[PDB]
Design a protein around this ligand. Structure first.
Ligand SMILES: C[C@]1(NC(=O)C2CC2)CCS(=O)(=O)C1
Ligand SMILES: [Zn+2]
Length: 140
């Protein structure tokens, strides 16, 4: 579990979004595993605006943050997980690291801020849904 809190927006994995998220919906995309909802309080996170390929991510199933290199946002085939079938996911970055389903929502960050959130795992990789292209998160 986990979210990004930027401005008055809450960015979550679409598959973990709550009824309140859907009732306060700003934007969602199944192919990306992302959903954004509106918040009453302003949030503490800054979104990275960059093409970094190195950062640090939080792994809840290890209680640890790991430094990783990751691929640029890509259309990737993802094998079946507990929460999605085998399918293509877009805007997905991969690193070598540990990820189980409950790790979804952990932040990946670089020197510029939050890059994305854990969205995939298995076979010794961790996949992250990118948010750095969502420039509208920074305003309004
Ligand atoms: C921009 C992008 N396109 C590609 O690179 C080739 C066409 C597949 C689609 C969105 S993405 O997945 O972020 C990567
Ligand atoms: Zn960066």
């Amino acid at each position: 579990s986990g979210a990004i809190y930027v401005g008055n927006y809450r960015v979550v994995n679409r598959h973990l979004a709550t009824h309140n998220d859907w009732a306060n919906l700003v934007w969602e995309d199944s192919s990306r595993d992302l959903l954004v909802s509106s918040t009453t309080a302003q949030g503490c996170d800054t979104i990275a605006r960059c093409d970094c390929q190195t950062g640090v991510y939080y792994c809840s199933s290890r209680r640890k943050h790991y430094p990783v290199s990751f691929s640029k946002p890509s259309l990737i085939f993802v094998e079946a997980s507990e929460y999605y079938p085998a399918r293509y996911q877009s805007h997905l970055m991969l690193a070598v690291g540990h990820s189980e389903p409950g790790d979804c929502g952990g932040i990946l960050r670089c020197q510029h801020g939050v890059v994305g959130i854990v969205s995939t795992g298995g076979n010794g990789l961790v996949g992250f849904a990118d948010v750095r292209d969502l420039l509208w998160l920074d305003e309004e």
